Design a protein around this ligand. Structure first.
Ligand SMILES: [Fe+3]
Ligand SMILES: [Fe+3]
Ligand SMILES: [Fe+3]
Ligand SMILES: [Fe+3]
Lengths: 169, 169, 169, 169
């Protein structure tokens, strides 16, 4: 075992590896969305910028978990990163609806990992999740839900989607 | 009585205590509205900000009356602040209509207070009302009237509401 | 349910509405004290400034709970804010003893809310309480206890009260 | 009549000349106190500075009434300024009690002048009194009442008087 390992359960080590892959998959989804919105027949640069930033942050989130794995003396095991569920994301509202679902899928995973850490009496790990993940996840879900409501108000299609796009830019 | 009290009628003292409560009530109503417009299914950030600011101003007007009561040798007697009439305020137009009616209700009470002070020959209090309250009240009522007209022109629902809310940001 | 709600128990939602009202009530108690100490026959501006700041802090804490209700998809329910039963606060020491009792009362309710959140496996809400509420509450209680001891040493009536008040300003 | 006189009643003109003399008399009373508190066997420099400033303020108020007489086309009639009957002012508290009595005496006369102006339908003169005289007068009376209460708390003789004086400097 690692010279640094102390009070680090192998179930928590395994779940951290699962989370690393999930964060990376989410980064891939938002990368796909970002360049979809730069197609010459889509051309929503506000949405595109929103999802590039989203993609960048998910990748930083994955790296924080990799760095965390090493800090506790666990071993990073990287798996294939699945292809995004879609190539083409449709309207702005549909991409936001997919992003809301993905964020809540990641949040449930984060909450399950917290329950695993709690049951294994790992307060260093529960503190990591509460500090660096569960807070941003809740604010992220709130922000996308707000944006869906505003987009439905503005449009959601036609002139409204055009005017809404200018606010994410 | 007070070592300071001079030409201060007990009817004026009591009406000041009523006005303190009314200002605090108005502040509470506007706080309710402000966080209503931050609901994920409402998401009107300009309306939210407008009513937050209105709430703060009302609490400041209440505090000016409390300071005033002490200046004149009267005794502040605080009363229960009633729950806001609504928990949910509907559209941005419906909230503005509620606000206009509230602003005209407060204005009527302030004018009755001015009548009471004038009838008790208290020019220090009539001056207070004219400088610190009556002016802002008329400006506030004209502003909300302007807003109701603009929002009816833009919308008042859908894209016009989305666009008008940007102007309160 | 709210499009954003996830892992948010109805008991925690109800408890947060309860807590908003108690922070607003505390705000009102400190507002009462603040202007009591500006009476011409009391004239303790340091105490007045201390309790004014306490009033603002409690109102900010109430609003953070309202923001929190909205973040999680709960619905804010605002209720009447009762007036303090005894607004004749007495000496600075008696007001400080009342403040300490109130701070501990709020602290007990916050711990009960922590226990409800914990029992419902809500680490997002326990994180909020530890960071935004329980830390300040222990610091507040310690600060007021210090003040009570310092004022009993100085005074707590006459010249000692006069001098202690000046170190509060 | 004066080429500028318009809507200026002779009773208001006479009352303003009366008021100039009373502000000048008040100035003289505070000048007496100011140098009384610089006696080597009194030695209260904070009180001395307070009453010196009060003396200057009263003289400025007298001169604003003289300017006002000229603005309206009335004719300034200056009369003898009586000396204070008792220039042995006693403790700081006794001087403060004398100041409060004087401030209220001046306030009553100003309200009588407001009533004369109002009865003669002179809104220019009621505007002058509310803005330039009645506001400062209530603020002065409140400030002195506060001071009396603070000095009674601190002292009002011995070390408390010594310390209160230093907070006045
Ligand atoms: Fe994440
Ligand atoms: Fe107001
Ligand atoms: Fe609090
Ligand atoms: Fe004067």
């Amino acid at each position: 075992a690692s010279q640094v390992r102390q009070n680090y359960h192998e179930d928590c080590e395994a779940s951290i590896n699962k989370q690393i892959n999930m964060e990376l998959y989410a980064s891939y989804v938002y990368l796909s969305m970002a360049y979809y919105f730069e197609r010459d027949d889509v051309a929503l640069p506000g949405f595109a910028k929103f999802f590039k930033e989203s993609s960048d942050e998910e990748r930083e989130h994955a790296q924080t978990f990799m760095k965390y794995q090493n800090k506790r003396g666990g071993r990073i095991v990287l798996q294939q990163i699945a292809a995004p569920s879609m190539q083409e994301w449709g309207t702005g509202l549909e991409a936001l609806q997919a992003a809301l679902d993905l964020e809540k899928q990641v949040n449930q995973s984060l909450l399950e990992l917290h329950s695993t850490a709690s049951g294994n009496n790992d307060p260093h790990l529960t503190k990591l999740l509460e500090r660096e993940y569960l807070e941003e996840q809740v604010d992220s879900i709130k922000k996308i839900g707000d944006m869906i409501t505003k987009l439905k108000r503005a449009g959601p299609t036609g002139l409204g989607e055009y005017m809404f796009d200018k606010e994410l830019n």
